[model samples]
Target: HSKKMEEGITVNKFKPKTPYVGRCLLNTKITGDDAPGETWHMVFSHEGEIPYREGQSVGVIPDGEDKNGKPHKLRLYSIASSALGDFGDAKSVSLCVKRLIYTNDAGETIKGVCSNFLCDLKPGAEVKLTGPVGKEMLMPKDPNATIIMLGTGTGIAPFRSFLWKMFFEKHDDYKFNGLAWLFLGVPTSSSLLYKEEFEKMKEKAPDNFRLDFAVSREQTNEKGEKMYIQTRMAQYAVELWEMLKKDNTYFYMCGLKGMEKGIDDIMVSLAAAEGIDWIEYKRQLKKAEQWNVAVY
Candidate 1:
C-alpha cells in the first residue's frame, strides 16, 4: 500500500479511448429504497486482472454522446471494496455511487449521466471502464499509523476499502494496530450507506474502531445548529490537534468541497490558539504525505 502511494501512476489494462467492457456483477441499492437520493453498490466482474489499491478510483464512460455528438468524457468513481474485492475473491471490484439529480434555476431536473447509467445498470449488462485511477488517498505503509477519516455521501467509498483492509480482510500482509476514527455526515439515518456493515465492524472492534455521525436532519450540535462533519471536527478540535502532533497519525478528507472551508477555518483558529501557524503546519503535513483529500 505504501509503495503504491509513493510510486508513479499504476498502469491498468484500460485507459481513455481504450476501455474494458465488463459485465456488471451486481447493482444493489445501498441507500433506502425510498430515500430522497439513491446510492448503489456496483460490482463489475474483472477476472482478477485490474490491479488496484485501496483509495484508487476507476473511470466510466457513459453510453451516450454530448451535444456535439462526441462520446461523453470519462467519469471517475472511487473503489468501494478492498483490492481483494468485497469478500476477498480477487475477481471483482465495486463502486459506491449516488445517482445525481437536482433542479436547476429553471426548475428543470437534471440527472448525472454516468451516475444514473451506473445506478440503473442490471446484472450481466456491460459497461465501459477505464483507468484504475489515483494514489493520493492510499493507506500508509505503517500498520500502526492512526487514521482519521472524514467523509460524506458516496465519499465513504475509499474509506470503506481502507476499513476492510484494516479490520475485515486481515490480509496478513497489513495488520492494523493504531486507532481508526471515521466521522461521516449524512442527511438522515436512512441516507447512511453501508450503515449496518460499519456498525457490525464497530461492534466487533470497539477498542480500535470509532464511528461518529453527523446526521443533519435529525441531529444538532452544541450550537443547536444542524450537525455537520465540520461541527464534529470542531467538537474534537483539541483532541484532533493532539493527534495531529503524533508522527504516526494520518488525516484524510473526501467529500463536499463546502466542508473544506469550514474545516480550514476551524483548524486555523485552533492552531492560532495553540500558537502555531496553521497554513505552514498544513503544508508540512502535505510535505510529509500525511494529509490527503479528494473532494468535489
Candidate 2:
C-alpha cells in the first residue's frame, strides 16, 4: 500500500549494501505449491536513524565472517517501513525473507545466504544494519495522492512499508483523500504474505487500499496454464487507466526487472486506449512527479 508515486530507483531494503544484524521476531511457514520452505520477517533495532522512506533501501552487513572475524560485506535491501522516524534505535526495521530450495549442479539444494541466515535467527538475535540508501525510490510525504505499487515475492518489502505508513495514518482516524492501489504478483497462494491483513485494510479503505494478487503458476483461466501480472493488468486496463487520470496519481512500481518491463507494457495499452500520446503520456507522468519506477 502507498499514498503517492515517484520515479527512478529500486525500492526494498531487505538486502542492504552494508552488513548488519537484526533480531528475529517471527518466521512462519507458508504451505501449498508455495512449499519447499518458509519465510521470515525479522525486525532490527539500531543506533542511529537511517532516514529511509517507505520505498527506499538499506545496506546490510551479515553477521558471519571469512575466518578473520571480519563481518561479511554489506548488501543492499529496500526499507520496509515508512515511519521508523529519524531515531535509529527505535526504528525497529523489519525484513520479509524467503527460503531458497533450488538444487545446484553438485546435487545440493541451493541456499540464499542472507535469507537462510535470517530464517534461522531466533528471537533476541542481534543483526547488523546499515544505510537507508537510494533517494529516487523513496515515498513522498503527500497524503492526498494516489500511490500505485506493483511487486512480487520478497519484492513486497517496500510496498509493506507503504502499507505500514497508511495503517498508522489511518489509525489516527484521519480521512485520507489519496488511494493506494497495490498489485502483488506471487508464484502461488501460499507464498502470499499478509493476505488476511490486507483484507482488513480493504475493510478500512475499500476505495483506498485495493489489492489484487497475481498467482502466476496457480491461477489459470480454465486452461491450467500460468498467468502473469501484465495479463492480469490487461484484465483491469480500464480501471488502471481510470486511476491514472485521477489527480495526484503516483504510478509506483517495484520488483524484478522482468516484471518491470511487463508493467510498462500494460501501461502502454492503457495509454493507447486512453488516446494519450506515448511520449506525452510519459511526459505527463514525469511532470506530475508521480512516476515512481524502481527496479532491483
Candidate 3:
C-alpha cells in the first residue's frame, strides 16, 4: 500500500513547470573546513503555501540553462527540518545539501551543477522549487513506537526531521514516548551532522534518546577493521534482536547503498543464534513494511 499525507499535509498539487519561487533565507555550513565534502543547511521561504510532512522531500530547480539551452534539471532533496522549519514557521523549508564533487577518469575535477548552485546561494537569492515529494520515510502514528534509525553521510537528512519532531518542537502534535535510537555513520568527527543538537537532545532525554556514532576514520572494530555501522550494530546485537521482535518497533536504514549487505550479514548471525532463520524473518519484515531502507 502507498503512503498518504499525514493529516495536515497535502500531496502532489505542484508541478515542475509551475513552481514556487522561494527565497534562500540562509545557507549555513554544517561541516567543518577539514571535512572531505561541504554540506550546507539551506533554508528557503515561499510566498505561497506548501504543505509538507517530516519525511517528504522537495524538488530544487537549478538556475540557468542546460546543454540544449533549456532550464537545468530539478534535483530532489530530503527535507532536513521538521514540518515546522528551524524557525518554527511552516512557510519555510530546509535541506541538508552536500556540494557534489568528484574526480573524473582523466583526473579532472567535476562538480554537480545543482548542488554547487545551491551551495553557492546567498541569502535572499530567489530559487525555483517544486513538489514536496515522498512519504515512505514518514514517522509512524503511534507515538510509542520504537524507531531505530541508521544513516550514513547526508542520509541523516530525514532522520534529522524525525528527531526534531520527537524532541525539539514544543506542543507539537506528536510526542514521542518510545525509544529512539540513532546510529549515525560518518567519516570523521568533522563530518558529524547536527552534532551539537544531538548532544543537547541526549542531555535532555537520555533515557528515550540514544545516539551511537560510527566514525570510520577515527574508530576501530574488534578485528582491527575500520569501524562501520555494522560493527556498532553487531556490538548491540542482542538488544537490537529483542527490539526488532516488538510489534511497535520500526527499523529505518538510510545512507550509502553498501551498508545494506553489512547490516544483513550482522543480523543473520544475531538471528541464527536465537534459532531464527534471518532470511525468512527479513522477508516477513519486508512484507509488513517494517524494514525501511533508503540508501544512495
> On residues 1-296, what C-alpha lDDT tens digit does candidate 2 reach at each position?
33334433333433444344555454445444544467666666653344355666666566678568766676667766555531223456666667666788999877766667767777777777666566556665576767888887777778887776675453353345688887888877787777776788889888777888988877865455566777667778887788778766777777777887777676776677768776678777766666767766
Which of the predicted structures, 1 or 2, would earn the higher TM-score when compared with the native?
1
Between candidates 1 and 2, which one is better according to lDDT?
1
lDDT of 3: 0.86
Give TM per candidate: 0.95, 0.78, 0.94
Candidates ranked by lDDT, best first? 1, 3, 2
lDDT of 3 by residue, 1-296 (tens): 32222566666557689988889989999899888898999999964477888888888889889889998878888889888778887788888988999999999999999999999999989988888787677887778888899999888999999899889887535578998999999998899999899999999889999999999999998789888898888889889999999888889887788999999999998889889999999989866667887787
- Local lDDT at 59 for model 2: 68
For candidate 3, report its TM-score. 0.94
Candidate 2 achieves a global lDDT of 0.67
- The prediction achieving the highest TM-score against the true structure is 1
Q: Best by lDDT, which number?
A: 1
Q: Please, what are the lDDT tens digits per residue for candidate 1 over residues 1-296?
A: 35235455465669878898889988898887657798889999988768888888889999989999999999999989988888688789899999999988999999989999999999999988887888788888787888999998888999999998888875656678889999999888888978888898899889889999988888888679888888877888889989999888999899777878888998999889989999999999987878899998
Models ranked on TM-score: 1, 3, 2
Clashing pairs in 1: none
